[PDB]
Design a protein around this ligand. Structure first.
Ligand SMILES: CCCCCCCCOCCOCCOCCOCCO
Ligand SMILES: CCCCCCCCOCCOCCOCCOCCO
Ligand SMILES: CCCCCCCCOCCOCCOCCOCCO
Ligand SMILES: CCCCCCCCOCCOCCOCCOCCO
Ligand SMILES: CCCCCCCCOCCOCCOCCOCCO
Ligand SMILES: CCCCCCCCOCCOCCOCCOCCO
Ligand SMILES: CCCCCCCCOCCOCCOCCOCCO
Ligand SMILES: CCCCCCCCOCCOCCOCCOCCO
Ligand SMILES: CCCCCCCCOCCOCCOCCOCCO
Lengths: 289, 289, 289
């Protein structure tokens, strides 16, 4: 069986003083299509493969291609994936919950380098022999993630730096905890990164959270992001403040709102301020199909 | 929801004295697949996105890729589209009705340069930051089209030439009228083009029409195309004559026929003669799926 | 109507002493998706077109694109195809039946050069104007195949070498016979190749066969492959020995097994030895969807 799903999004993206001769505001858009092939068996083992075709405004050649494949096998809550896998640091819960706006961005997200599912081809040839193995296990409330990525599997191992990551999250109705650790993240020796986050659903409508990161070899240093959101019916308000160790850096912050127009149609906007005082704003829609 | 539709066509394409060392007759074919994602809402607003994958004989690398995305929002007969949009000059009725043969060609089509939906990627990088906005409105019988195309939206506007076009067509059971105007067509300063056409369904089986064009900065100058067609059951006969202002140019003309083999299967052929006395002929099939 | 089908496969691929600085064992995988558009008519003539998107580990740019189109028309058991066609030498029965392992490989396959359906684009530009015509006819038990491939249809014919091939196979419940002949195979002048094969289903569970090849201008010279397989329920055991004329060459051989895990899920493995004493082994799964 083969199924297609995806989303489209478009709106205005503003970055103050974007560049000399450049327009500060542009119409940023993305079309994403996922192609998923699945083979179910009566033994209870499911096999699957997926390909992604994603286009973003500004893409080279004004064209769209597929990325590298991901394959998996699931059985009893355990899933083993091979190829262009999802990594533990990128998969844990809470880590991206400060994001806002129609482009789901946040200066409060981790400021480190690490491997993650690649949505597109890479013209540089860097990903040509990139191959990962991932294992996930959902043990009611608790989720375990494990990933190993070999940036070039054809070359003798001792010559390449592989990334290994572990992550776990747990949640009940009002408290959520998450942690992750990755060594040689992004295939960079000694770029060991860590994450610890907690959230409290202090209501049926609101949640506040705190994420802490060890950004490894990043110039940002350690980071702390405090975020929260509150739902007033169909509209959700979001905000966050983030601080990094980098000497002289500013406190990043953002405020935004989401509006659930209909099932699968979300209108969002935000105004944010970065660590180097960058001012960014956006307003657009995302529709799922 | 995601739906796929498209067509395939193949046949013989002949151009007399095509070139030294070249074959005059080749097997020309095209495969077109449209991928459309739609999100309907109970509020009556529909959202959609589309991608096209088209291959034509002779395409570089013997491969097929997708083009740049188009997004739209429809509500009450009004549709607003963004990205790789359909333009007013290319969308009005009547303007392409002289076309014949399985490749739907005609020297009687406008001999000017203007932007239109891009079916494929562009290796030159010219379309990388190309973005348009289009608005259409169907007011029973009357159709309004509006388009604005910015060839490079990231660059300061005063530095780039944007194309703006307006078009309208109206029709009852036997008369049709259409007009269009585009300034800086194709992003070429002062390349202002215009179209005025009328058709008369002098029967249930036949129609004759007259299209007039102001080809802007084209060497063709003004143009007049007289065309007509008549249906004898499943077979339709077509013909046209076209004249351009260019000094020394010949009168272009063509004769062809269509045969509706079955629903979605059309066999067509034509023999045409161009403004520079080019002789072209074709015979093939188009099947829709 | 448009339908998608395909398969995914992954496993371990081992080649002893693969290269200096290289890993002998890698995780080799492939994702194949076929897009087929069909137009059925009440006259009993079916039209179709197909595109393939295939990705294999190691592919350049870590991306996936479509290949060149194939079109066809079927009526009363006769099918005429145009474009990226399947060729007679590659389509006859028996010729690939010695293949084993999850990657369906065999040193016993013909060691010659010939054209065949192209699953992917070609960055070299060699396939840009490649066009073939194929005709097949199924006359109960007997299958006829005919193919003509013009490597560059735009260039004067006398300047290019076209490939022409004929093939036929016949089978009843226990005996199968197949033969094929192709002149200027692969567009190489005088590279005339031939195949003759026979198989005997000496049981409901086992079959033994013998394939003989004239490899044309290949250094292999004539070749003989003796193969057989036997099914013990869900597991099938396979083996083959192959000999080529090339002076000093070793006898190639392989042993492998298939395990039908469920409908559409096959686990396979093999250990093989080549003509130059290459030792290869593999173990993986193929799942169809
Ligand atoms: C300097 C900006 C130049 C481009 C024109 C700006 C006005 C564009 O909006 C109109 C068309 O729709 C496309 C953009 O999406 C904007 C609105 O937000 C999405 C729906 O709320
Ligand atoms: C195999 C799937 C098709 C993907 C291949 C596209 C390869 C294009 O690059 C070829 C070399 O030229 C370099 C292009 O510049 C960078 C393009 O990518 C960047 C923006 O998305
Ligand atoms: C010329 C700039 C155009 C692009 C950016 C527009 C940016 C402004 O929108 C910001 C929205 O976020 C504001 C806060 O939301 C709080 C709650 O009230 C809204 C309830 O739906
Ligand atoms: C100089 C031409 C060289 C190629 C061979 C010419 C004969 C080809 O037609 C046979 C195969 O079908 C493919 C082409 O479509 C032609 C017929 O028109 C379509 C159906 O009416
Ligand atoms: C990103 C989607 C894949 C589209 C990218 C293909 C890019 C190929 O070009 C890379 C640079 O090389 C130049 C090729 O020559 C022109 C090819 O296009 C012309 C015929 O259709
Ligand atoms: C060697 C050249 C091969 C490719 C071109 C073939 C061109 C000839 O076909 C032209 C058909 O148009 C003729 C006029 O149609 C008029 C009506 O009668 C047909 C009714 O179905
Ligand atoms: C030197 C090899 C380096 C990579 C790790 C080897 C172990 C890999 O197998 C585990 C993950 O699944 C992916 C590979 O498929 C192998 C098993 O065969 C398929 C199912 O029987
Ligand atoms: C038009 C469909 C997209 C296919 C075009 C990809 C063209 C990429 O090549 C552009 C020129 O650069 C040469 C690349 O090196 C070889 C890539 O292919 C080999 C491995 O599969
Ligand atoms: C380190 C090498 C890893 C990759 C290669 C593994 C190769 C070994 O597997 C070979 C299997 O073929 C053996 C013969 O099968 C005979 C029948 O018994 C099996 C019944 O299901």
């Amino acid at each position: 069986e083969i199924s297609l799903n995806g989303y489209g999004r478009f709106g205005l993206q503003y970055v103050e003083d974007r560049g000399v001769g450049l327009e500060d505001t542009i119409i940023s858009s993305r079309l994403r299509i996922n192609i998923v092939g699945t083979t179910e068996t009566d033994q209870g083992v499911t096999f699957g493969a997926k390909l992604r075709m994603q286009w973003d405004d500004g893409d080279a050649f004004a064209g769209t291609a597929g990325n590298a494949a991901q394959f998996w096998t699931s059985y009893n809550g355990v899933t083993v994936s091979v190829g262009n896998v999802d990594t533990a640091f990128d998969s844990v819960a809470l880590t991206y919950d400060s994001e806002m706006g129609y482009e789901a961005s946040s200066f409060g997200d981790a400021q480190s380098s690490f491997f993650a599912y690649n949505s597109k081809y890479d013209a540089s040839g860097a990903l040509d022999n990139y191959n990962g193995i991932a294992v996930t296990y959902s043990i009611s409330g608790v989720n375990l993630y494990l990933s190993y990525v070999d940036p070039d599997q054809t070359v003798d191992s001792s010559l390449v730096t592989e990334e290994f990551g572990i992550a776990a999250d747990w949640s009940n109705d009002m408290i959520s905890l998450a942690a992750a650790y990755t060594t040689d993240a992004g295939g960079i020796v000694d770029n060991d990164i860590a994450f610890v986050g907690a959230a409290y659903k202090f209501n049926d409508a609101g949640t506040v959270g705190l994420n802490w990161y060890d950004n490894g070899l990043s110039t940002a240093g350690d980071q702390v992001t405090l975020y929260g959101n509150y739902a007033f019916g169909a509209t959700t308000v979001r905000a966050y403040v983030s601080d990094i160790d980098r000497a002289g850096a500013d406190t990043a912050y953002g405020i935004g709102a989401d509006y659930q127009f209909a099932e699968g149609v979300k209108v969002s906007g935000s105004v944010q301020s970065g660590f180097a005082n960058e001012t960014v704003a956006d307003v657009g829609v995302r529709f799922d199909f």
